[PDB]
Amino acid sequence: NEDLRLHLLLNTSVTCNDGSPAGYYLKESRGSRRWLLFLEGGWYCFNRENCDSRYDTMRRLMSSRDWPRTRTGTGILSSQPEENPYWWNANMVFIPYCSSDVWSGASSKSEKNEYAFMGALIIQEVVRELLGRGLSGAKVLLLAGSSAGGTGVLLNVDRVAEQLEKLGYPAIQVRGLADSGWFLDNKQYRHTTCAPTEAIRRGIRYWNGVVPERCRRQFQEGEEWNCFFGYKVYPTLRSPVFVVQWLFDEAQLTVDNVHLPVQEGLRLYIQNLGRELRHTLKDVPASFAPACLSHEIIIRSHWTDVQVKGTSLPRALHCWDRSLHTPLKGCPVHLVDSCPWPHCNPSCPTG
Ligand SMILES: *[C@@H]1O[C@H](CO)[C@@H](O)[C@H](O)[C@H]1NC(C)=O
Numbered sequence: 001n002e003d004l005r006l007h008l009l010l011n012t013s014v015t016c017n018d019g020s021p022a023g024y025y026l027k028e029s030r031g032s033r034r035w036l037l038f039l040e041g042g043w044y045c046f047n048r049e050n051c052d053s054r055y056d057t058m059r060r061l062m063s064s065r066d067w068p069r070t071r072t073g074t075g076i077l078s079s080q081p082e083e084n085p086y087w088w089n090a091n092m093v094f095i096p097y098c099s100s101d102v103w104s105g106a107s108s109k110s111e112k113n114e115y116a117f118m119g120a121l122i123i124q125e126v127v128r129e130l131l132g133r134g135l136s137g138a139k140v141l142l143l144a145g146s147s148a149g150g151t152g153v154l155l156n157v158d159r160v161a162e163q164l165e166k167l168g169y170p171a172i173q174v175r176g177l178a179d180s181g182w183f184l185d186n187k188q189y190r191h192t193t194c195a196p197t198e199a200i201r202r203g204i205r206y207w208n209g210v211v212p213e214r215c216r217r218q219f220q221e222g223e224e225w226n227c228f229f230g231y232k233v234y235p236t237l238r239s240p241v242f243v244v245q246w247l248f249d250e251a252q253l254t255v256d257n258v259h260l261p262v263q264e265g266l267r268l269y270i271q272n273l274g275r276e277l278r279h280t281l282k283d284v285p286a287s288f289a290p291a292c293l294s295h296e297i298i299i300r301s302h303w304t305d306v307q308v309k310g311t312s313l314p315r316a317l318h319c320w321d322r323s324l325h326t327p328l329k330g331c332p333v334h335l336v337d338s339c340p341w342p343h344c345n346p347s348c349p350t351g
């Protein structure tokens, strides 16, 4: 099945990196008032030099020129209850990542600018055009996303909520689901701008990157890079946000320059990383954090398989839905592994 259909943005001034129109894939579900808007990930580029390289061999992340007319919804975007016990009947939207800016930019390609970085505006424009296609009648809009899309959720969920309030739709409940987008600005295991802190600092300047207002007001000018880190930006958010995060995320380990017989130094580094991640989730009431070495989960077809403390992610998300109607009997929403080494959870993806 190729069930989500491409719509290029009617406002063609909201563009991918190269000035081609951004867009979204839609599969409508009549009668359902649930809308799932999923932000694709795919790293980023923070200067002309690496953006030019990304344009040569990763061009679909920078242009809509070669996008197919349809995409198959998989995992949480699947309409089959067997693949998606959580939201199989929802209206499904897949928003391709073609701005290379962690969904934070609001700058057009112009005289001074070889590339457009419009991720924040892309989300705004998708939401605006969807209101005329059924979203106006929604009761829940779940803004989900994986990897850089997961960080995009944290950066944009409150802006979507404010956008709908100002447009006159206060009844739509905007919620966030951030998958694999909860990073630590930690010490690298070996020094190498791959390090998470420096990459984001350069990005905002290059991108015209914007961050949630309450977080911006805490860290102030020149320090907005802090708001790309989940444990710093999450406490400032008003919309409900469910956090999915492997304790030993492969992209975290990459920017940490960890490449997998492990000796004491690396063992301690890996164990400290998991404990740090676990600590940052202690006060996140809706979270699913398995002790696995892996990367993304929610649009993979076997996303149903992993469990924490006996509860799957689709179940935990259903429990979260119920909690948003005191804790529920047999329906937990805070699921963080406590064991300290990759794959100490037997349900981790096999690879
Ligand atoms: C098109 O999008 C741009 C970027 O946000 C915005 O400035 C402009 O007002 C939009 N125009 C229309 C007609 O929607």
Ligand SMILES: CC(=O)N1CCc2c1ccc(Cl)c2Cl
Pocket (backbone or CB within 6 Å): 041, 042, 043, 044, 102, 147, 148, 149, 151, 181, 183, 184, 196, 197, 200, 228, 229, 251, 252, 255
């Ligand atoms: C793969 C990816 O997308 N990565 C890895 C590091 C990172 C990403 C996305 C957002 C932020 Cl803040 C950070 Cl540190």
